[PDB]
Design a protein around this ligand. Sequence first.
Ligand SMILES: Nc1ncnc2c1ncn2[C@@H]1O[C@H](COP(=O)(O)OP(=O)(O)OP(=O)(O)O)[C@@H](O)[C@H]1O
Ligand SMILES: Nc1ncnc2c1ncn2[C@@H]1O[C@H](COP(=O)(O)OP(=O)(O)OP(=O)(O)O)[C@@H](O)[C@H]1O
Ligand SMILES: [Mg+2]
Ligand SMILES: [Mg+2]
Lengths: 634, 634
Amino acid sequence: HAVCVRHAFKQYGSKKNPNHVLSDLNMTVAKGTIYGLLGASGCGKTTLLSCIVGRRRLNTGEIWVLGGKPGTKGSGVPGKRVGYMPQEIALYGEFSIKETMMYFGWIFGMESSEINERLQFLLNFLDLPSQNRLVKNLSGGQQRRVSFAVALMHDPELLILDQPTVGVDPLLRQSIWNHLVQITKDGNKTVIITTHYIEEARQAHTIGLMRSGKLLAEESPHVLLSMYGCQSLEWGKIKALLQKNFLRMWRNVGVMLFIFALPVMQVILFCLAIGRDPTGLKLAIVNHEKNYTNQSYQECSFDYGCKFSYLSCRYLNNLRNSTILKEYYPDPESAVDAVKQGHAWGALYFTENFTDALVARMALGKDADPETLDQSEVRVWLDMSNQQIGIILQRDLQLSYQDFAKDLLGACEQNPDLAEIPISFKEPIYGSNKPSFTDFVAPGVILTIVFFLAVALTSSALIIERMEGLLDRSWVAGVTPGEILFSHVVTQFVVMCGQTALVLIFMILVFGVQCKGDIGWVIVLTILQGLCGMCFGFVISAICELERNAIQLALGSFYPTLLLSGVIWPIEGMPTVLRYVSTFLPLTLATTSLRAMLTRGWSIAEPAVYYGFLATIIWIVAFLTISMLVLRFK
Amino acid sequence: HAVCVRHAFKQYGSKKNPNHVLSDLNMTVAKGTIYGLLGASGCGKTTLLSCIVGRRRLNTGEIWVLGGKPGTKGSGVPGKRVGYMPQEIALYGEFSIKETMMYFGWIFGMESSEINERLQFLLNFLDLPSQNRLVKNLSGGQQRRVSFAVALMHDPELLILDQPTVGVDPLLRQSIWNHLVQITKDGNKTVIITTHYIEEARQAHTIGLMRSGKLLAEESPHVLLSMYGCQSLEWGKIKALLQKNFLRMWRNVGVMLFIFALPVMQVILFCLAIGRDPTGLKLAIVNHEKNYTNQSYQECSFDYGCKFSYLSCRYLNNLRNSTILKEYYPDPESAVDAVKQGHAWGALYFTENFTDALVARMALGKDADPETLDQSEVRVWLDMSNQQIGIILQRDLQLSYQDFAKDLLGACEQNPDLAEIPISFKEPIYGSNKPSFTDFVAPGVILTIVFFLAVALTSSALIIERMEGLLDRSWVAGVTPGEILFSHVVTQFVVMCGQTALVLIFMILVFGVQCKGDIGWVIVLTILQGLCGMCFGFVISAICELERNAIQLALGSFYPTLLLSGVIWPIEGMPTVLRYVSTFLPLTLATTSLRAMLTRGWSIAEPAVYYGFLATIIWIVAFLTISMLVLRFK
Ligand SMILES: Nc1ncnc2c1ncn2[C@@H]1O[C@H](COP(=O)(O)OP(=O)(O)OP(=O)(O)O)[C@@H](O)[C@H]1O
Ligand SMILES: Nc1ncnc2c1ncn2[C@@H]1O[C@H](COP(=O)(O)OP(=O)(O)OP(=O)(O)O)[C@@H](O)[C@H]1O
Ligand SMILES: [Mg+2]
Ligand SMILES: [Mg+2]
C-alpha cells in the first residue's frame, strides 16, 4: 500500500453555508498500479491530491502515505521519494532549462555531473529546444513539458501527476502516456495521474471515479465495462537555493550597481550641505559720520593708533569680512524699510555723535548719565524670521565687539584682559571650544543611513516567493521553512557589508570626522546595526501579504525613528515619559554609544558604551524569532 | 473579408541566429464560417492570434481585420465588436463573478440593468456557483468557464478563442462546442478557435493547418478527409475602472485605517520631541566658602539686601531652578574627575576669597591689577562632547550673570542699565527676540510629511496591474493608456486630501504652530505640494518593471531631500554651485514660500511667495508627461 485514506472529511466556508467537498473518501493505491482518479468538473479531485502531499490539513480524517501521516517523521511526503506536478505551471520564468533542472537537481542530493547525464536524455525523449533558452520565451506547450521533466528526473517511487497532458498535440500526449506505462512495468513505482480526457485513461489499471464527495468505484477499466456500462468509457538545499538568490542580482546588473552608488551620494550631500555657516547675508549700515555716496561705498579713513577718532567706522571692518556683506543707506527710516521687504537681514544705526559718546563712556565710569548712555549705543533691528541666520547674526555683532574693545585697551592704556566677563570657560575636558552642528549630528546619521539601506534591501525578499511561483511545489521537496530565511540572510549580508564600508570610507577618510576612540569597535557596531536593520525588514515581509501593503509600512517608519532617536536634538528634550520609552529602541542607544567613541574616546569597557551592543543584539534576536514564528505558522 | 493577412513576417531570435516563427502566413477568414486553426505544438499559433488583436506587431507584412489594420480608426480592433479569450486565465481573483462581469460590463457601454439578465442566462447555461463567490475561491474548471462568459456576453461580431475547452469534462465541453454552432447559424459572427483537441474539431467548416510558418490547407474537414488522406491527418470606461480602484481599498480596512494614523502619529512625535529645552542636567559646584556636608546641601545664605556678603551664593540660585541641577564637591581636583567619567556636565569653582576679589573689582574699575583679576573668576570646565547641550550651558552661566550684575546696581543705589554692551538689539521686525529651533523646522516638515506619504501611496499602482492580469485583455477592450493613469489620480487624490488636512489640524489647531499670513493659501499650497509628490511616485512605477526596484528607489530618495531642501539648515551653507542647483527642486522653493506665510505674514502678491506655486506646478506637469510618455510607448 502506497497511499490509503480512511474517513476523510473536508469542507470550506462558514457554518452558515457548508461546502462538503469530501464525505468519506475510502480508497487504496496498491503499489505498482497506475491509479487514475477520474471524475466530474466541480467535485473534490485536486483538493484530494493536494491533501496527499500535505498541502492542506484534512480536517479530522485518516491519511496514511508511504509509511505514515504526511509531514511526520514516519512517512515520506516531504523528500526525494515523492514526485509532484501542479495543476498550474509553477516554474520560475527567469531561469533557463539547464538552470531550473539544477535548482531541483541538487535539492534531492543529485551529483552535478549526474544531472546533465540525464538532462540530455529527457530533452531527447520529449522534444524541447536548446537548454540555454529561458523558460519565459517558451510556448505554452513547451512550458508544460519542462514541468513534466523537472519533477520526474530524480526517479521517485510515487508520482502525483495531475492534468499532465493539457495543452500538447496528440502525438506528444501519446508519447507521455507511453512512458508512465513503461517505468511501471515492474512493481517499483506508482502513479496517481488524473486527467479530464477519459479516452486515454484506458491504459490505467485501477481507474477510480468520484461522484459526490466519495469514491464511486475503483476497478480495472475492462472490469468497469460490462458492469456499469457497455462500450468505450461511460548542504544540497542550502547550495540549491543560494545560486538562485545570487543569480537574481546578476540578471539585472545596472540596478545592483545603483545600490552601490546610493551611500556615496547620500553621504556627499550630507557633508556638503549640513554644518557650514552662511556666508552671503547682507546688512543695512547707516553710519551718520561719513557722507553718503554711491550705494556700496563709504569712507572709512579712521585714525589707526592711540588717537581715538571715528570710532564708528572702526567697529566696522572689525567684524567678519566674509560672512557679512555691507550695504549703506542714508536714512534710518529707509534701512528699516529695506529689511522689511527682504532686501537685507538687519539694519545698524550709528548716531551722529557716536565717538564722543563712546570716548566719554569709557574714560568716565559709574557716573554715566542717561543722556550720555543713549547716543553711544549701536541700534540694530534684526529680521529674526529664520531663527538660524538671525542667531548667528546676533552672535557675530556682539562677539566682534569683544575684538573692538580689546583693540582699544591693547593699543593705548592697559592689558587686553579688563574687557572680560568674570566667568572664564577654561579648556573643555572632552570637546572643543567651538562646537559645530555637523559634528553632533554626524555620529547619529552614519548609524541611520546604514539602517534604512538595509531595510530597503530585505523588504520584499520574503514576499517575492509567491510572485515567481516555485515555492509551494518546493515545500514538497523538503525545504524547511527555516531554511529559506537563512539563505536570505547570507545572500544579503554580503551585499550589505559592501555598502556599509562605503559609508565609513567616505565619511572618515575623504571627509574629516574625528575618530579619537578605537576604530575596530566602530566597524563592528556599524555592521551590527545594519544587520539589525535587515532583520527588521523580515518582520515586515513575513507579516505583510500584499506587495503594495509592505512598501508603505517600512517607508512609513522613516520619520518616527529619525525623531525618537537622538539625531538632531538631544535625547534630554523629551518629557519624562517619552524619554523612558525612547530608550528601548533599536537606534536610540547605538547613537549614544557611537558618540562616546568618536568624540570622548572611551573603549568598550566603559558602561555607557557596551549598552549599544547589548541593546542591538537583543533586537536582532527579537526580530528573528518573530519572523520565523510567522513563517512557521503558515 | 473579416480577417486577411498577406505576406506576414515575424522572427524572435537575435541577429544572425533568427527564430523564423512565421514565413508567409496567407489566410482568409470568411463572412460567417467557424475557422479552426489547428497545428503542431511549437509552431506559431498563439503568436498569430496575438498578432491579430494587435498585441504584437508584425515585422514586414499586411494584416487587415474588420476593414483595416489594427490601431487605425477605420478598423475595429480595440473596440466592443471583438471578443477575446487569452490562453491563460487573465482574471482578477479578488472579484466575485458578478463584480468581474460588471467591470467588463460597462466598458463596452452596457446598461447596468441589462447586464444582469445576460449574467443569469450565462450562469444557467454553463453550470456555475452563486454569483457572489470570489473567483480565486473557484476551482480550475469553474475559473475557465467564467472566462468564457466574459468574452461572450457583449455579443461581438468576431470571436477569437485559443484553447477554450481545457480542464473541463467532456459532458460540458460538448455543450461549449454546441454553442458556437447555434449562434453562428446565420452569417453574422465569425469564430477563430484553436484547439489541440482534434477529435471535436470536425464541427467547424474551414479547418486550417500549419506545418512550418505557412498555412498548409484551408478546406472543409469532410473535404479535407477526402482530398489527400483517409483519417488522422495530424464615461463607461472611467466608471468601470474606478469602482475597482475604490474596491481594493475596502477589502483591507485593517490597513486602510493605518494610513490614516501615520500623519497623526508622525506629527505628535515631532512636536513632542524636537524643540524643548533640555531640563535634566547636573553640575559640580565646589564653592570654597561654605562648609561641605552631605552631597546635596551647601548652606546657601547670602545676606539678602544691599549688604555685599557671600557673593558666591548670590550668583548661585540665580541661574535656573528648573533646567540645572546642583551637586556639590569639596575639591577642585575631584569635580574635574566627575565630569571626566560622565557623572555631570560641568564643574564650577569659586575661590576661597571670591567675594573680596569681586567687591573690589567693581570699585577699582580701570585700576584693576592682575593679582585681583585672577582671583574673582568663576572657573568652569565644560564637557563639550554633545555640542548642543554645552551650547545651552555656555549660554546660561553667562546670561544668568546679567541678572546677577543687575541685581547689584539695582540693589542699593543705581540705575540698572550701565551693565549692557553698547549694542542694543531693539525689537525684531518680523520674528521674536527668543528664537526656537522648533519654529524653524516646522514650516518645511509639514511640506515633507505630506510629500513622502503621497509617494508611498501612488508608487506601486502602475506595477500592480500586471500582478492580477486584466491588462492583456483590457488594452483590447478599447482602454487607452491615458485613462488608466487618470483614474489612478482621482482615486488617490481623494484619500490624499484626507490625510493632508489631518496634518494641518494636528499641527496648527492642537499643538499651536502660529500662522500670521493667511490660512486660505497655506491649505492650497500644502495640497498642491502633496499632489506633486503623488505624481512623482508615478514616474517611479512607469520606468520600473520589477517591483523590487520600487521600494529601493522610493525609500532611497529621502535623505537626498531632507539634506538638500533646507529643512534643518538654511540654504546658505552649501557652495555656490550646489546652492544654485538646489533651487530648481520640487521642495526647496516651497518651504521658503511657506516660511514667508506663517512667520512674515506676506500674501501671494509678494514675489518671493508665488514662486513656490509656480516652481511646483511645473514639476506636476513634468512628472506627468514623463510618466505618460513611458506608459504610452515603451
Ligand atoms: N517571447 C518569446 N521570445 C522568443 N521566442 C518566443 C517567444 N514566445 C514564443 N517564442 C517561440 O516562438 C514560437 C511561438 O510559439 P507559440 O506561442 O505560437 O506556440 P503555440 O502554438 O501556442 O504552442 P503550444 O500549442 O505548444 O502551447 C515557439 O517556437 C516559441 O518557442
Ligand atoms: N479556496 C477555496 N475555498 C472554497 N472553496 C473552494 C476553494 N478551492 C476550491 N473550492 C471548491 O471546492 C470544490 C472542489 O474544488 P477542486 O479544486 O477539488 O476541483 P477540481 O476537481 O480540481 O476541478 P476542475 O477539474 O473542475 O477544475 C469546488 O466546488 C470548488 O469551488
Ligand atoms: Mg485537477
Ligand atoms: Mg494556443
